[PDB]
Amino acid sequence: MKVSTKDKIIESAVMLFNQKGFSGTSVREIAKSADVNVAHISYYFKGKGGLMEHLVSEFYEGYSKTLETAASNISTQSTQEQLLQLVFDILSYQHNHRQLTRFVYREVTIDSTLIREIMSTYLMKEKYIFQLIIEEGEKQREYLTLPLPHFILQLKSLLMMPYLQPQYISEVLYMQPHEPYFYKMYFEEIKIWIRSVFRT
Amino acid sequence: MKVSTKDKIIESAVMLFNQKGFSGTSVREIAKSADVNVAHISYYFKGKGGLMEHLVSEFYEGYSKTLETAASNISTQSTQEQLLQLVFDILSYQHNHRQLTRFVYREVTIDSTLIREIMSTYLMKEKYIFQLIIEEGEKQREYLTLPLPHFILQLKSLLMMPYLQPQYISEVLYMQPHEPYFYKMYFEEIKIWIRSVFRT
């Protein structure tokens, strides 16, 4: 029904952290845009850094939920249709949090013990799930034509492009540079790519 | 010999725009770090936005110089060793301006008529040079196994990774996440990639 004061603060911090930078916005502007007293921010978050760490911690835990539920489907089906489901889920998760996603990938500062540690956690988990998926892929004659870290780097870099230089994506779907990003359309393009690096 | 006052200002703006954001730093902090009066900044650059546009205009014109001198070698040799030279030049240019490069690719704001127009220029030039290189590539039985916008998107996204999530690059060279970025090492990895999307 009604949005909690803590949620109002978060919603507002995402929107301004994404517009100006982290160092660009202040607790005061965040409060005024959330129509709450400044005291609420310090009470729930300690301050700007702590508000950032909450936003970054939230993003990566939502991201690794998609990873974990791909681990919980290693049975269901073939490992390439497995992988396509996980790519689809990330493209969708990225878009559903697009303001948060853009900020997390671009924010110029970041680095903050806690954040260096949130990131390390997600990367070890991401690495591990992709071996599992690729391992049971070899309990069937579906094999990567790439080492695993090579595959992950090209995947991760393609997944980030919508939030950095989307125009190149517009160009491959339209030979035009300024069409809006539709992630379901992009998925088709990544799928073709994924298919081209499996051999039977 | 001695660094010009205008250069002192630029050097300082690059270093702080890269540390905090654009909206994070002020003309006052830029002046103090350059040991020049604030008046010099307004005189040469109008202000923070105008200083940014100078830094972004400089980055892309240095980038398209590497593109233009690859156009001026369509004669010299084979189009894949052509392409490898251009990739090498960009990796090197990116690193030689690494503080500038990181800021240009990550800065959360940007967009400013002028900048929307600097970007459009470079992208049309980049697109055009890559057709030339790939066209004379077909006056010899060296062909892309990818459409041209697909090739450019994957190349451009691999070229940007050192300034966004370098750890994935460390992992492919070392199976370790925190080694320093050596662009000459990365070039070898992109070269293998480039080779895998040409057919004879």
Location of structure tokens 């039977």: A200
Residues of B in contact with A166 (CB under 8 A): none
- Of B197, B62, B65, nearest to B129 by C-alpha is B65
Q: What class, spelled out in words, does domain B1-47 have in CATH?
A: mainly alpha
How far apart, in whole angstroms, are the C-alpha atoms of residue A168 and residue B158?
13
- Coil vs helix vs strand at B73: coil
Cα B130 to the center of its chain, rounded Å:
16
* Chain A closest-CA separation from residue B188 CA (Å): 13
Pairing of strands A143-144, B143-144: unpaired
How far apart, in whole angstroms, are the C-alpha atoms of residue B177 and residue B180?
9
Q: Say yes or no: A195 contacts chain B, CB-CB below 8 A.
A: no
Interface of B with A in 112-141 (CB under 8 A): 120, 123, 127
Q: Answer whether A103 sits within 8 Å of B108, measured CB to CB.
A: yes
How far apart, in whole angstroms, are the C-alpha atoms of residue A154 and residue A158?
6
How far apart, in whole angstroms, are the C-alpha atoms of residue B104 and residue B119?
11
Nearest to A177 among B108, B123, B157 (CB): B123
* Chain B closest-CA separation from residue A32 CA (Å): 19
Sign of CA dihedral B176, B177, B179, B180: positive
Distant-in-sequence, close-in-space partners of B88: CB < 8 Å, separation ≥ 6: B187
* Chain B closest-CA separation from residue A156 CA (Å): 9
Q: Answer whether A108 sits within 8 Å of B107, measured CB to CB.
A: yes
* C-beta separation of B117 from B173 below 8 A: no
* C-beta separation of A102 from B105 below 8 A: no
Mutation to test the A interface, candidates B25, B105, B108, B192, most A Cβ within 10 Å = B108
Chain A residue with the nearest C-alpha to that of B15? A108
Q: Answer whether B164 sits within 8 Å of A161, measured CB to CB.
A: no
Start and end residues for every CATH 1.10.10.60 domain found in chain A? 1-47
Residues of B in contact with A177 (CB under 8 A): 120, 123
Distant-in-sequence, close-in-space partners of B139: CB < 8 Å, separation ≥ 6: none
Residue type, B33: S
* C-beta separation of B192 from A167 below 8 A: no
Chain B residue with the nearest C-alpha to that of A189? B150
Method by which this entry was solved = X-ray
CB atoms within 10 A of CB B44: 16
- Cβ-Cβ pairs closer than 8 A, A with B, add up to 116
Strands (E) located in B93-158: 143-144
At B26, give phi and psi (nearest 5°): -120, 155
